[PDB]
């Protein structure tokens, strides 16, 4: 016997007490150890409505990750609201770790186990758990990295696909690796490598899903129409360095109408001057460290926006987007909601 409810959650993790790595340090003081034998009870003949777009767990994780970044990735200079802040800006060890979100006494988390669940509506296979799965708090745009995969078909998530102002989340069912590197000795020059055969196969499957939602209209991908570099480029943080990558080459319509099924290499740049995703101001960091900077990640999702208009063409156009970091958390927490016992 329960009802939907909000409360302050706590976090659990496997952070290492001997690590200097920044996610570990934060978690050692802010989270508790995980349960090696977590209990999960499946509820027979039970149906629940979920709404991933209104799930306060999302709001709480955002607050947490902001706090983490505010304490850690402090810049040499911070320009916010007209003031200038100068402080020490040492190089750090940076590599996200999985974080579990857990309910306090008197509360529990319901989990939707429907394989093709889109994030909103009734769920027939519901279980109760104390903690979510382990989520790495990866901040990125355009492409979702190192996340969890869909268990069956690719899933399109939107509060309302017909409403062009709502961001679309594409949940992939098969991972595509992205290999970004700054070769040892222009210190800001980098590049990301993507399997063109795997990627072009997978993106098309996404297109077939979009056709299912848009009355079999033609699906076209296009580059972003504008905005800050953090949104128009695939931005993320690798080993403490802020990478900005051009994804123009990723969404090329031509190769699936040849000679494309090869390796795709995107040009990237490490930036010292960044627009903080925290929404405050501009931040200045020190030049990149020396040597080979390499991060290999799984692409597990895509963030899209569909073009608005008074149109009635035979095409629907989608462009990579994001910038609302809440969407990143939404993509992982979509199957969970908090309820109050008694």
């Amino acid at each position: 016997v329960w009802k939907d409810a909000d409360t302050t959650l706590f976090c659990a993790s496997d952070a290492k007490a001997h690590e200097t790595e920044v996610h570990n340090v934060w978690a050692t003081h802010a989270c508790v150890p995980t349960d090696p034998n977590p209990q999960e009870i499946h509820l027979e003949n039970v149906t629940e409505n979920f709404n991933m777009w209104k799930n306060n767990m999302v709001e709480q994780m955002q607050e947490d990750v902001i706090s983490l970044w505010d304490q850690s990735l402090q810049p040499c200079v911070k320009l916010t609201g007209g003031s200038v802040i100068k402080q020490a800006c040492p190089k750090i060890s940076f590599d996200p770790i999985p974080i579990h979100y857990c309910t306090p006494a008197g509360y529990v988390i319901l989990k939707c186990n429907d394989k093709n669940f889109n994030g909103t509506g009734p769920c027939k296979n519901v279980s109760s758990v104390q903690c979510t799965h382990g989520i790495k708090p990866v901040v990125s745009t355009q492409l979702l990295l190192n996340g969890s995969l869909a268990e069956e078909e690719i899933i399109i998530r939107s509060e309302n696909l017909t409403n062009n102002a709502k961001t679309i989340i594409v949940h992939l069912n098969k991972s595509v690796e992205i290999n970004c590197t700054r070769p040892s000795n222009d210190i800001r020059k980098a590049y990301c490598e993507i399997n063109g055969t795997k990627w072009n196969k997978v993106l098309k499957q996404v297109t077939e899903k979009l056709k299912e939602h848009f009355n079999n209209k033609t699906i076209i991908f296009q580059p972003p129409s504008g905005g800050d570099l953090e949104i128009t480029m695939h931005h993320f943080n690798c080993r403490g360095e802020f990478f900005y990558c051009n994804t123009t080459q990723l969404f090329n319509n031509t190769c699936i109408g040849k000679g494309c099924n090869g390796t795709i290499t995107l040009p990237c740049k490490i930036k010292q001057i960044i627009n903080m995703w925290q929404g405050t101001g501009q931040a200045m960091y020190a030049p990149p460290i020396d040597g080979k900077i390499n991060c290999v990640s799984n692409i597990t999702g895509i963030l899209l926006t569909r073009d608005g208009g008074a149109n009635n063409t035979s095409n629907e156009t989608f462009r990579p987007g994001g910038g609302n970091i809440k969407d990143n958390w939404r993509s992982e927490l979509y199957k969970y909601k908090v309820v109050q016992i008694e």
Epitope: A165, G227, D228, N275
Partner: antibody, heavy 132, light 100 residues
Framework: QVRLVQSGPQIKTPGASVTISCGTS????????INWVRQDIGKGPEWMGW????????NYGRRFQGKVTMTRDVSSGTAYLTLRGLTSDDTAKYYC?????????????????????????WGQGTLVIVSS | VLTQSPGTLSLSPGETAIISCRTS????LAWYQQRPGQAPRLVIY???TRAAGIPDRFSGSRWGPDYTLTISNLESGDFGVYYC?????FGQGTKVQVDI
């Protein structure tokens, strides 16, 4: 007190460029998407596009693709619209609009989280004439 | 996607003006009011919900695809052109004409 104050009217030569402003005050400029609408008397209102004050994300209508760019100044809390390669067809009045708010005092809000289309707040508009 | 009708209503104070608007799609609808030379003013939003500061004389209703806005006891303050709106789509407009 949620006021939208647009810049004054202006005439331009066929081919020039217009940059009209949209002054905002009385609300956190970063929590609401800002739309742009075009009204030519003789016809009805036409939505041109919205921009997210947060990241700068824009959604241009296919009919206005390449003739329209939407920017912003997070400092002054001001939205902007610049028109490229003016023709006699661009002779119209241009509004900057936003919908009803849904944040309700939350600390971290994004304009893409609200509905946006319930246009309650309009500017006074700005006349742009493209004639020789 | 949107078809508003009629184009012009020549009515008088006291009478009840009826403005219809058929949609190919469906969902949330708003009704706007444009006094000559002035910016449009939100009157009905989300279908039937009356906006703030709107007198009871204005009300929204539906029956199938044909959305309607009925205005009871007209006054000269109700003069102007009205538009229906689904998301970013607007109607052609209904020019309601006040009279003396």
């Amino acid at each position: 007190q949620v006021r939208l104050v647009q810049s004054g009217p202006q005439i331009k030569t066929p081919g020039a460029s217009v940059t009209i402003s949209c002054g905002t005050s009385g609300y956190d400029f970063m929590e609401s998407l800002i739309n742009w609408v075009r009204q030519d008397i003789g016809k009805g209102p036409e939505w041109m596009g919205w921009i997210n004050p947060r990241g700068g994300g824009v959604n241009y209508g296919r009919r206005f693709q390449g003739k329209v760019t939407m920017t912003r100044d997070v400092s002054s809390g001001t939205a902007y619209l610049t028109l490229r390669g003016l023709t006699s067809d661009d002779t119209a009045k241009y509004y900057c609009v936003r919908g009803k708010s849904c944040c309700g005092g939350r600390r971290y809000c994004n304009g893409a989280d609200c509905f946006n289309w319930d246009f309650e707040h309009w500017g006074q508009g700005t006349l742009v004439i493209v004639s020789s | 996607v949107l078809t508003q009708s009629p184009g012009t209503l020549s009515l008088s104070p006291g009478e009840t003006a009826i403005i219809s608007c058929r949609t190919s799609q469906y969902g949330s609808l708003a009704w706007y009011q444009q006094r000559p030379g002035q910016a449009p003013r939100l009157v009905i939003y989300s279908g039937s919900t009356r906006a703030a500061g709107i007198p009871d004389r204005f009300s929204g209703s539906r029956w199938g695809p044909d959305y309607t806005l009925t205005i009871s006891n007209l006054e000269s303050g109700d003069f102007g052109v009205y538009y229906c709106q689904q998301y970013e789509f607007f109607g052609q407009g209904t020019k309601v004409q006040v009279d003396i």
